[PDB]
Amino acid sequence: FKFELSNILKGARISVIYSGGDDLFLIGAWDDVISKALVLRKAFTRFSAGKLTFSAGIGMYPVKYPISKMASETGVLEDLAKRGEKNQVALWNDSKVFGWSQLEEQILKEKMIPLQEALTNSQEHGKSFLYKMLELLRNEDQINIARLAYLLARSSLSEELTQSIFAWSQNKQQKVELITAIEYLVYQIRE
Amino acid sequence: VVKLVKLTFKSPVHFGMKRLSDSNHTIAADTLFSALIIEALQQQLELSHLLNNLVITDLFPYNKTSYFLPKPLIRIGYKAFKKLTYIPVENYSEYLRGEIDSLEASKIAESLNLGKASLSTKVSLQAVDHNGESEPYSVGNFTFYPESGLYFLAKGNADTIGQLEILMHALQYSGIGGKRSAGYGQFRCTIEDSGKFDSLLSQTGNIAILLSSAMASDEELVDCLEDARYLLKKRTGFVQSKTYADQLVKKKDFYAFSAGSTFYQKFNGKIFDVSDNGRHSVYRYAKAFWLEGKI
Amino acid sequence: MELAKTKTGEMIDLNFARKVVEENKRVKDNRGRQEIVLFNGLTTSKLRNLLELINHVYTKVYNSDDTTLSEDVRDELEYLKVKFAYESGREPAVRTFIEKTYVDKLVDVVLKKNTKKIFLDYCKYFEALVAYAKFYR
Amino acid sequence: YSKIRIVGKIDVLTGLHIGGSMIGAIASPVVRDPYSRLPIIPGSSIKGKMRSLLAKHIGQDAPEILRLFGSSQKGAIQSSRLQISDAFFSKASQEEFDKKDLAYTETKFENTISRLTAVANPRQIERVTRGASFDFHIIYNVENINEVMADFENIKTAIHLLENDYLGGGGTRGNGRIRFVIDSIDTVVGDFDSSNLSIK
Amino acid sequence: YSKIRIVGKIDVLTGLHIGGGGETSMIGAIASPVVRDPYSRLPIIPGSSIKGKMRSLLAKHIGLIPGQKMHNQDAPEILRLFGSSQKGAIQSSRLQISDAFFSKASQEEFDKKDLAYTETKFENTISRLTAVANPRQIERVTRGASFDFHIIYNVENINEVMADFENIKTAIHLLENDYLGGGGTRGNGRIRFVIDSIDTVVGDFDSSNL
Amino acid sequence: YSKIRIVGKIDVLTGLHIGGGGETSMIGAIASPVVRDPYSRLPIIPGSSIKGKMRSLLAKHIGLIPGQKMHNQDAPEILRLFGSSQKGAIQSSRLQISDAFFSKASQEEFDKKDLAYTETKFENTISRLTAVANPRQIERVTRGASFDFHIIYNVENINEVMADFENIKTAIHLLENDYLGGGGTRGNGRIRFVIDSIDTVVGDFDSSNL
């Protein structure tokens, strides 16, 4: 907490308000805070050789927004993660609580990276297509599953991604990861 | 004449602890007494009854399922026991005897559903017309569930009981807590004879537990402290009146044993004076209401 | 939606609509190139014409605040079954589509229920048939 | 001392955004009761709007304003006679909106067009749906028997000014128009005669 | 302090499309619907749309300073009428423009003759390259339909009221020669303020000649 | 800021068919209905159709850039006249073409001759191998029908106006030689444009010389 933490966070736009196994508080750029939070969980397990788990709450706030409010709201997110599924992290919203491995791979690697590479390659697609997909996923109507499939056929995205998105939407866990992965990509792509 | 007084809140209440942003789900007996005095002064009643015969309790959480008393400070998963703050009346004897386990304490903590706390972000536009700016501020409120309410037990003679009934009816329109007169604290109150509490109070146990936030007189303090497990709570605030001073004045800082504090030797309380050279004496209730228990 | 139970008791639902398109999908290697054929030759344009008929009734009821189906809406529904019958008689693939999806039978159920929700549910199923037909082509 | 209760109803004539997250999601929400999630009108918004309108009419700092809405000035500590509570989404409005499955609050899609690049920037706001009713509660404290009538006249003026004005939100762009229906004006505490008193 | 109420009607010369999103659309149905009041399900002309269009046209008429980035850089008359937001120079807007609501009389005129309030319009876009037409359906309010309007003017300075109302008239004149809502460069949203009624609803100001 | 108003008449030289969608049809009756105004149930020419055909004709006439994919890649003149949504180069449209409504003069003329506004043409597609035919019944506005066209031009730059109006005249000439609506290569949609009055309705611009 006091020494290795400086090397783990090295190179990231993060300021550590306080440290320690009792309570850890860091304020940083959101993409950096998430990536370093994942690095920390992997390091903690390695350092402890397992048998030790860390629960965290991650929140996204405008810079002008008050620190006390940031601290209070993020405390609640940490509490969500702590009460059940203590290893799992809570990110941005109460609705999104994810295991650290889930957040790192089943969301930021299996879903966000394909979508990211697909969008960049496609000259025919854009944030607006990703917003359309998100609106269907958010509504959660059975018809939207069908409407997403019509959008996917029109979209012409690579078939394996098309099928993977379709499968993800039908599975409840995959869709929350798909929603989060799309939202993370939109936050990253947005200027 | 111990009378239960159940309060049902129609609008959220503020109940500030140190700041306007924070909020509590309950209020101390002194905060209620100060409201009762302010009311009696408005209704032009004699303060002698309140200042000499009225004994009250901190407002305690109540649910349709149960009525919750404060957790006694008795030595007994320590986290689960420390997280617990209120114990139902039926489980109070079990907790005192030590028959409760950590999982049972967790269930007791989960049992209470007093309400859902929140923070309302308001703005002040008073300076906008003078080339100034809007000023954001936060008011912490607490919304009771519909069954959930705060109750208090009031003891005294018939005259002070009737005076309490009158003051309580006026109080519901007045409201309680902070930001009252700005949208908060409206409550509707019932006064009734409670078989549960009077039976509970009719016990002669080996230990005494403080129902109200109370402080002993100096002579009472020396006998009372021996073997006492307790939690000194600072009681501080500003004077709320139109006649105390031209400007707002803080009261003298007071420290009172918290509700649920356990004292081997019972001490009667005292209505202390936290005024500092004002046009009237600012009374701070610190009288003691005791629930005797067996450990 | 639980719109209807088909012969053998299978429920009619958006998942059923995906399955019905999937069962009636064949791959015919016409001129070497593999080509998807749905419902023994149903075309996109014919299904779009059928979807246009549903839309004209739908815009009325969907806009309408009232739940019970208006008498003119019930008329349009009866006309829809007449148009279904006409298209089935005029095209064998359309007859196969109507028989497999049970769309014509459902319109009678919607008339029996006289409910906006059962109408919206029939419209959803028809839309899923169209969406899945697009996805599997 | 007397306490007079004014119980009434607020009708939403244009969508109301009292105000008080995820991308492509409503950017501004409304104030809602935490347990019931129903939209509410804070008792501070009504009080502040009425005070501001009465200040504009009278002119704040006038003695009538300070005695109606309280003051903490040095040597002028006055309790607020008007205790306006939070207005709650009415049960009748809940019943009518539940029939026809009408959502209590509707998202409104707006945008701003820049004067430089002519580029639109979308915003989504939540407004309580028109046709919604809030049960509003007001308590008047009779600090002085001789200034009740005038105070009520002031109240009436403010309410009249409010009926041609908006409640909290972007009301200069068509939001927050309200109507007051005074159900009763009753004396809950004391022997005061409030039968002649009128808000509208 | 006086409040003058301007009440009247706006008449749809050509089909009006003020879009409102938030709802997924059925396949083959209208992709972009119009904003409708939720309770009446009847289309509405938002007061924000009218205010923004009037302010933009009035700003173009009065003139724009070179490189004007914000709306608070408009002319002092515009900031006086429609409001300002500068730090230390917050000007309260004299004009409060309400949402126009579909007229009951237009509703009756449409319920008889059995005409729908909104019309589906089938357009397409033809690619510059492939010359391939891609269709779309857009909802528009029908020409016959009329919307009741309601505006409040606050008399904060009694001297400028005439001039302010002149600006309002100029703005309305511009709005009559311009359109409202979206798609107005392809023939949508032409309107006219055929009905006006000006009355001092609050106070003692003289609005007889306004 | 000046607005110039052009009013006039579009005259149908040959039966004109502009497609409309969602119209229920009787078996064996008209299966290709022309666009109609919902209120009066009369044929209407959409301003979107006029604007699209004029813009396409003018853009192709001056010359498309090789491999052009979007409308925003048109020549700068076309972008200034008809608008441009290009990212970072959004340009306003000076032309505001509106819906052309069936004129009362032509409607009264038809009613005098007891003629319906929209003719029904019978056409068929014949297979050139099996000689099997597929009959179609379409709707075309009857020849000699006239539509009231109303175009608003905005004077953003005083210097540009003369060249802009020259371009509009060129586009009108293109649309006269070209058809409007569908099936033009089979004779449908020939039209004529006459001008009633070019007047400046907003501002002090002198439009008499135009």
Short mmCIF file of N, CA, C and O in Angstrom, two decimals, chain D residues 92-185:
data_model
loop_
_atom_site.label_atom_id
_atom_site.label_comp_id
_atom_site.label_asym_id
_atom_site.label_seq_id
_atom_site.Cartn_x
_atom_site.Cartn_y
_atom_site.Cartn_z
N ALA D 92 -54.58 10.64 -7.13
CA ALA D 92 -55.49 10.72 -8.27
C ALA D 92 -54.72 10.76 -9.58
O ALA D 92 -55.11 10.12 -10.56
N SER D 93 -53.62 11.53 -9.63
CA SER D 93 -52.79 11.55 -10.82
C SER D 93 -52.15 10.19 -11.07
O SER D 93 -52.00 9.77 -12.22
N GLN D 94 -51.78 9.49 -10.00
CA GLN D 94 -51.24 8.14 -10.15
C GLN D 94 -52.26 7.20 -10.77
O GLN D 94 -51.93 6.41 -11.65
N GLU D 95 -53.50 7.26 -10.26
CA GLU D 95 -54.56 6.38 -10.81
C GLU D 95 -54.75 6.69 -12.30
O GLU D 95 -54.67 5.75 -13.10
N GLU D 96 -54.95 7.96 -12.64
CA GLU D 96 -55.24 8.31 -14.06
C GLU D 96 -54.06 7.95 -14.96
O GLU D 96 -54.31 7.46 -16.06
N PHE D 97 -52.83 8.14 -14.49
CA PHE D 97 -51.64 7.85 -15.34
C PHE D 97 -51.45 6.34 -15.42
O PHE D 97 -50.96 5.84 -16.44
N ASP D 98 -51.82 5.62 -14.36
CA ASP D 98 -51.70 4.13 -14.39
C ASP D 98 -52.68 3.62 -15.45
O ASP D 98 -52.29 2.70 -16.20
N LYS D 99 -53.89 4.17 -15.50
CA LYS D 99 -54.79 3.80 -16.62
C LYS D 99 -54.13 4.40 -17.88
O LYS D 99 -53.66 5.54 -17.79
N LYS D 100 -54.06 3.64 -18.97
CA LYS D 100 -53.42 4.10 -20.24
C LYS D 100 -51.91 3.92 -20.09
O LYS D 100 -51.18 4.31 -21.03
N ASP D 101 -51.45 3.41 -18.94
CA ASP D 101 -50.01 3.09 -18.76
C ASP D 101 -49.16 4.33 -19.05
O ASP D 101 -48.09 4.18 -19.67
N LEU D 102 -49.58 5.50 -18.57
CA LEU D 102 -48.83 6.75 -18.84
C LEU D 102 -47.70 6.90 -17.82
O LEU D 102 -47.98 6.84 -16.61
N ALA D 103 -46.46 7.09 -18.29
CA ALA D 103 -45.33 7.34 -17.37
C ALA D 103 -45.54 8.68 -16.65
O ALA D 103 -46.01 9.64 -17.29
N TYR D 104 -45.18 8.74 -15.36
CA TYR D 104 -45.34 9.97 -14.55
C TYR D 104 -44.47 11.08 -15.12
O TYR D 104 -44.91 12.25 -15.12
N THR D 105 -43.26 10.74 -15.57
CA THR D 105 -42.32 11.74 -16.11
C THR D 105 -41.95 11.38 -17.53
O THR D 105 -41.80 10.18 -17.81
N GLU D 106 -41.84 12.38 -18.41
CA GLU D 106 -41.51 12.15 -19.84
C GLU D 106 -40.16 12.78 -20.20
O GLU D 106 -39.93 13.94 -19.81
N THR D 107 -39.30 12.05 -20.92
CA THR D 107 -38.01 12.62 -21.36
C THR D 107 -38.27 13.59 -22.49
O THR D 107 -39.07 13.26 -23.38
N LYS D 108 -37.61 14.75 -22.46
CA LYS D 108 -37.78 15.76 -23.54
C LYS D 108 -36.43 15.89 -24.26
O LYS D 108 -35.41 16.05 -23.57
N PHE D 109 -36.43 15.83 -25.58
CA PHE D 109 -35.17 15.88 -26.36
C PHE D 109 -34.98 17.28 -26.91
O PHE D 109 -35.81 17.73 -27.72
N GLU D 110 -33.92 17.96 -26.47
CA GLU D 110 -33.63 19.30 -26.93
C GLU D 110 -32.23 19.34 -27.52
O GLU D 110 -31.48 18.38 -27.45
N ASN D 111 -31.90 20.48 -28.12
CA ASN D 111 -30.55 20.71 -28.59
C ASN D 111 -30.29 22.21 -28.62
O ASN D 111 -31.22 23.02 -28.57
N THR D 112 -29.01 22.57 -28.68
CA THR D 112 -28.60 23.95 -28.88
C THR D 112 -27.78 24.03 -30.16
O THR D 112 -26.96 23.15 -30.44
N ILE D 113 -28.03 25.06 -30.96
CA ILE D 113 -27.29 25.28 -32.20
C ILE D 113 -26.32 26.43 -31.97
O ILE D 113 -26.73 27.53 -31.60
N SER D 114 -25.03 26.16 -32.18
CA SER D 114 -24.01 27.17 -31.92
C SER D 114 -24.11 28.31 -32.93
O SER D 114 -24.42 28.10 -34.10
N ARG D 115 -23.85 29.53 -32.46
CA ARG D 115 -23.82 30.70 -33.32
C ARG D 115 -22.58 30.76 -34.20
O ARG D 115 -22.52 31.59 -35.10
N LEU D 116 -21.60 29.89 -33.95
CA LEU D 116 -20.35 29.88 -34.69
C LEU D 116 -20.30 28.78 -35.74
O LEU D 116 -20.07 29.05 -36.92
N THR D 117 -20.50 27.53 -35.33
CA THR D 117 -20.35 26.39 -36.21
C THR D 117 -21.68 25.80 -36.69
O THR D 117 -21.66 24.90 -37.53
N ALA D 118 -22.81 26.29 -36.17
CA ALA D 118 -24.13 25.76 -36.51
C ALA D 118 -24.24 24.27 -36.21
O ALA D 118 -24.98 23.55 -36.88
N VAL D 119 -23.52 23.81 -35.20
CA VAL D 119 -23.49 22.40 -34.81
C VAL D 119 -24.45 22.22 -33.64
O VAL D 119 -24.35 22.91 -32.63
N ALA D 120 -25.39 21.29 -33.79
CA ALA D 120 -26.34 21.00 -32.73
C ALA D 120 -25.70 20.13 -31.66
O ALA D 120 -24.99 19.17 -31.96
N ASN D 121 -26.04 20.42 -30.40
CA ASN D 121 -25.54 19.60 -29.27
C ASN D 121 -26.75 19.06 -28.49
O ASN D 121 -27.40 19.86 -27.79
N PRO D 122 -27.06 17.75 -28.56
CA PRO D 122 -28.26 17.24 -27.91
C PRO D 122 -28.28 17.16 -26.39
O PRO D 122 -27.25 16.82 -25.79
N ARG D 123 -29.42 17.48 -25.78
CA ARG D 123 -29.59 17.31 -24.32
C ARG D 123 -30.92 16.58 -24.08
O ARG D 123 -31.88 16.85 -24.82
N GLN D 124 -30.97 15.68 -23.10
CA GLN D 124 -32.26 15.04 -22.76
C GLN D 124 -32.64 15.45 -21.33
O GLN D 124 -31.79 15.30 -20.43
N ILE D 125 -33.85 15.99 -21.15
CA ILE D 125 -34.30 16.45 -19.80
C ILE D 125 -35.54 15.64 -19.41
O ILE D 125 -36.23 15.16 -20.32
N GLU D 126 -35.79 15.49 -18.12
CA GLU D 126 -36.98 14.76 -17.65
C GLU D 126 -37.96 15.82 -17.13
O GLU D 126 -37.54 16.69 -16.37
N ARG D 127 -39.20 15.77 -17.61
CA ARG D 127 -40.24 16.72 -17.15
C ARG D 127 -41.41 15.91 -16.61
O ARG D 127 -41.77 14.91 -17.25
N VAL D 128 -41.99 16.33 -15.48
CA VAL D 128 -43.21 15.61 -15.01
C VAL D 128 -44.26 15.82 -16.11
O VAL D 128 -44.38 16.96 -16.60
N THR D 129 -45.02 14.78 -16.45
CA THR D 129 -45.97 14.86 -17.59
C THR D 129 -47.07 15.85 -17.32
O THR D 129 -47.55 15.91 -16.17
N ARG D 130 -47.49 16.60 -18.35
CA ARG D 130 -48.64 17.51 -18.21
C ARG D 130 -49.85 16.69 -17.75
O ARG D 130 -49.95 15.51 -18.14
N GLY D 131 -50.76 17.30 -17.01
CA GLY D 131 -51.88 16.60 -16.43
C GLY D 131 -51.59 15.97 -15.09
O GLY D 131 -52.45 15.27 -14.54
N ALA D 132 -50.40 16.19 -14.54
CA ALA D 132 -50.03 15.68 -13.24
C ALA D 132 -50.46 16.65 -12.15
O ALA D 132 -50.43 17.87 -12.34
N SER D 133 -50.88 16.11 -11.02
CA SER D 133 -51.36 16.89 -9.89
C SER D 133 -50.51 16.58 -8.67
O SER D 133 -50.19 15.42 -8.41
N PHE D 134 -50.14 17.62 -7.93
CA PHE D 134 -49.38 17.49 -6.70
C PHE D 134 -50.21 18.03 -5.54
O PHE D 134 -50.77 19.12 -5.63
N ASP D 135 -50.29 17.27 -4.45
CA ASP D 135 -50.99 17.72 -3.25
C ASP D 135 -50.06 18.64 -2.48
O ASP D 135 -49.12 18.18 -1.83
N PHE D 136 -50.32 19.95 -2.53
CA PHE D 136 -49.47 20.91 -1.85
C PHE D 136 -50.10 21.31 -0.51
O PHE D 136 -51.32 21.41 -0.38
N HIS D 137 -49.23 21.52 0.47
CA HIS D 137 -49.61 21.78 1.85
C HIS D 137 -48.89 23.04 2.32
O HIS D 137 -47.68 23.17 2.11
N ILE D 138 -49.63 23.96 2.93
CA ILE D 138 -49.08 25.21 3.41
C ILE D 138 -49.61 25.46 4.81
O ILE D 138 -50.78 25.20 5.10
N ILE D 139 -48.73 25.95 5.70
CA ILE D 139 -49.15 26.30 7.09
C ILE D 139 -48.78 27.77 7.33
O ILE D 139 -47.62 28.13 7.10
N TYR D 140 -49.75 28.58 7.74
CA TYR D 140 -49.53 29.98 8.06
C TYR D 140 -49.59 30.16 9.56
O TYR D 140 -50.54 29.71 10.21
N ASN D 141 -48.54 30.80 10.09
CA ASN D 141 -48.46 31.05 11.56
C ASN D 141 -48.89 32.49 11.81
O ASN D 141 -48.27 33.40 11.23
N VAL D 142 -49.91 32.68 12.64
CA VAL D 142 -50.46 34.01 12.93
C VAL D 142 -49.59 34.61 14.03
O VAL D 142 -49.88 34.49 15.22
N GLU D 143 -48.50 35.26 13.61
CA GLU D 143 -47.67 35.98 14.57
C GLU D 143 -48.35 37.26 15.04
O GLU D 143 -48.09 37.73 16.16
N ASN D 144 -49.22 37.83 14.21
CA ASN D 144 -49.91 39.07 14.53
C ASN D 144 -51.30 39.02 13.92
O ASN D 144 -51.43 38.80 12.71
N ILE D 145 -52.32 39.20 14.76
CA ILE D 145 -53.70 39.14 14.28
C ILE D 145 -53.98 40.28 13.30
O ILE D 145 -54.78 40.13 12.37
N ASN D 146 -53.31 41.42 13.47
CA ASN D 146 -53.61 42.60 12.68
C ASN D 146 -52.97 42.60 11.30
O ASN D 146 -53.31 43.46 10.48
N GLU D 147 -52.07 41.66 11.00
CA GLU D 147 -51.46 41.58 9.69
C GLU D 147 -51.81 40.31 8.94
O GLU D 147 -51.16 39.99 7.94
N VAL D 148 -52.82 39.56 9.39
CA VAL D 148 -53.20 38.34 8.67
C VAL D 148 -53.74 38.68 7.29
O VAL D 148 -53.22 38.20 6.28
N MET D 149 -54.74 39.57 7.23
CA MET D 149 -55.41 39.84 5.96
C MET D 149 -54.42 40.30 4.91
O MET D 149 -54.33 39.70 3.83
N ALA D 150 -53.62 41.31 5.23
CA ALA D 150 -52.63 41.80 4.28
C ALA D 150 -51.70 40.68 3.85
O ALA D 150 -51.45 40.50 2.65
N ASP D 151 -51.24 39.87 4.81
CA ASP D 151 -50.36 38.76 4.45
C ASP D 151 -51.05 37.85 3.45
O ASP D 151 -50.47 37.51 2.41
N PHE D 152 -52.32 37.52 3.70
CA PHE D 152 -53.02 36.65 2.77
C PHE D 152 -53.17 37.33 1.42
O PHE D 152 -52.97 36.67 0.38
N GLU D 153 -53.41 38.64 1.41
CA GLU D 153 -53.43 39.35 0.14
C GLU D 153 -52.10 39.20 -0.57
O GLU D 153 -52.05 38.82 -1.75
N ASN D 154 -51.00 39.38 0.16
CA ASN D 154 -49.69 39.16 -0.43
C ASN D 154 -49.59 37.75 -0.97
O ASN D 154 -49.21 37.55 -2.13
N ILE D 155 -50.03 36.77 -0.18
CA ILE D 155 -50.00 35.39 -0.65
C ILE D 155 -50.77 35.27 -1.94
O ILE D 155 -50.24 34.79 -2.96
N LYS D 156 -51.98 35.83 -1.97
CA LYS D 156 -52.79 35.77 -3.18
C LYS D 156 -52.03 36.36 -4.35
O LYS D 156 -51.88 35.70 -5.39
N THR D 157 -51.43 37.53 -4.16
CA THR D 157 -50.70 38.16 -5.25
C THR D 157 -49.61 37.24 -5.75
O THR D 157 -49.55 36.94 -6.95
N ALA D 158 -48.83 36.67 -4.83
CA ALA D 158 -47.76 35.78 -5.25
C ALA D 158 -48.32 34.61 -6.04
O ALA D 158 -47.85 34.33 -7.15
N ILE D 159 -49.40 34.01 -5.54
CA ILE D 159 -49.97 32.87 -6.24
C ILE D 159 -50.45 33.30 -7.62
O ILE D 159 -50.20 32.61 -8.62
N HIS D 160 -51.08 34.47 -7.71
CA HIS D 160 -51.50 34.96 -9.01
C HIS D 160 -50.30 35.15 -9.91
O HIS D 160 -50.28 34.65 -11.05
N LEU D 161 -49.24 35.76 -9.38
CA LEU D 161 -48.02 35.92 -10.15
C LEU D 161 -47.46 34.57 -10.56
O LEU D 161 -46.91 34.42 -11.65
N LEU D 162 -47.61 33.57 -9.69
CA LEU D 162 -47.08 32.25 -10.02
C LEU D 162 -47.91 31.59 -11.11
O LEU D 162 -47.37 30.86 -11.95
N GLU D 163 -49.22 31.85 -11.14
CA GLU D 163 -50.05 31.20 -12.15
C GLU D 163 -49.75 31.72 -13.54
O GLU D 163 -49.97 31.01 -14.53
N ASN D 164 -49.25 32.95 -13.65
CA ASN D 164 -48.77 33.49 -14.90
C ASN D 164 -47.25 33.37 -15.04
O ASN D 164 -46.67 33.96 -15.95
N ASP D 165 -46.62 32.61 -14.16
CA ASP D 165 -45.20 32.32 -14.19
C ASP D 165 -45.01 30.81 -14.18
O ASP D 165 -45.96 30.04 -14.36
N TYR D 166 -43.77 30.38 -14.00
CA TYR D 166 -43.42 28.97 -14.00
C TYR D 166 -42.82 28.57 -12.66
O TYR D 166 -42.32 29.41 -11.91
N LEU D 167 -42.89 27.28 -12.37
CA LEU D 167 -42.18 26.71 -11.24
C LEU D 167 -40.76 26.35 -11.67
O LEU D 167 -40.37 26.53 -12.83
N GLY D 168 -39.97 25.83 -10.74
CA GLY D 168 -38.54 25.69 -10.98
C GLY D 168 -38.25 24.86 -12.22
O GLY D 168 -38.83 23.80 -12.43
N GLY D 169 -37.33 25.36 -13.03
CA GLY D 169 -36.92 24.72 -14.26
C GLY D 169 -36.77 25.74 -15.36
O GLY D 169 -36.92 26.94 -15.14
N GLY D 170 -36.48 25.25 -16.56
CA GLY D 170 -36.33 26.14 -17.70
C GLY D 170 -37.66 26.65 -18.21
O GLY D 170 -38.08 26.33 -19.33
N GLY D 171 -38.33 27.47 -17.40
CA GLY D 171 -39.70 27.87 -17.68
C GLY D 171 -39.86 28.95 -18.72
O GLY D 171 -40.98 29.15 -19.21
N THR D 172 -38.79 29.65 -19.08
CA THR D 172 -38.86 30.62 -20.17
C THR D 172 -38.92 29.94 -21.53
O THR D 172 -39.19 30.62 -22.53
N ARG D 173 -38.67 28.64 -21.59
CA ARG D 173 -38.78 27.85 -22.82
C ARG D 173 -39.96 26.89 -22.78
O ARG D 173 -39.95 25.88 -23.49
N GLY D 174 -41.00 27.22 -22.01
CA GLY D 174 -42.23 26.41 -22.04
C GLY D 174 -42.31 25.35 -20.98
O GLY D 174 -42.93 24.31 -21.24
N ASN D 175 -41.73 25.59 -19.81
CA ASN D 175 -41.72 24.50 -18.80
C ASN D 175 -42.22 25.02 -17.46
O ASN D 175 -42.10 26.21 -17.20
N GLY D 176 -42.87 24.16 -16.68
CA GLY D 176 -43.21 24.51 -15.32
C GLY D 176 -44.44 25.35 -15.12
O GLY D 176 -44.68 25.80 -13.99
N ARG D 177 -45.23 25.61 -16.17
CA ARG D 177 -46.48 26.33 -15.99
C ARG D 177 -47.42 25.51 -15.11
O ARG D 177 -47.61 24.31 -15.34
N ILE D 178 -48.00 26.15 -14.11
CA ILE D 178 -48.80 25.46 -13.10
C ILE D 178 -50.08 26.24 -12.84
O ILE D 178 -50.21 27.42 -13.17
N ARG D 179 -51.04 25.54 -12.24
CA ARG D 179 -52.29 26.14 -11.78
C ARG D 179 -52.52 25.71 -10.34
O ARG D 179 -52.22 24.58 -9.97
N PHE D 180 -53.06 26.62 -9.53
CA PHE D 180 -53.36 26.34 -8.14
C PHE D 180 -54.85 26.15 -7.96
O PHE D 180 -55.65 26.96 -8.44
N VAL D 181 -55.23 25.07 -7.28
CA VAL D 181 -56.61 24.81 -6.89
C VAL D 181 -56.61 24.71 -5.37
O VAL D 181 -56.17 23.70 -4.81
N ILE D 182 -57.08 25.75 -4.70
CA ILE D 182 -57.07 25.80 -3.25
C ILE D 182 -58.25 24.97 -2.75
O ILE D 182 -59.40 25.41 -2.82
N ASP D 183 -57.97 23.77 -2.24
CA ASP D 183 -59.04 22.91 -1.76
C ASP D 183 -59.66 23.45 -0.48
O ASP D 183 -60.89 23.48 -0.34
N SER D 184 -58.83 23.89 0.47
CA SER D 184 -59.34 24.36 1.75
C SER D 184 -58.39 25.39 2.33
O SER D 184 -57.20 25.43 2.01
N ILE D 185 -58.95 26.24 3.20
CA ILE D 185 -58.18 27.14 4.06
C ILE D 185 -58.78 27.03 5.45
O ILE D 185 -59.82 27.64 5.74
#
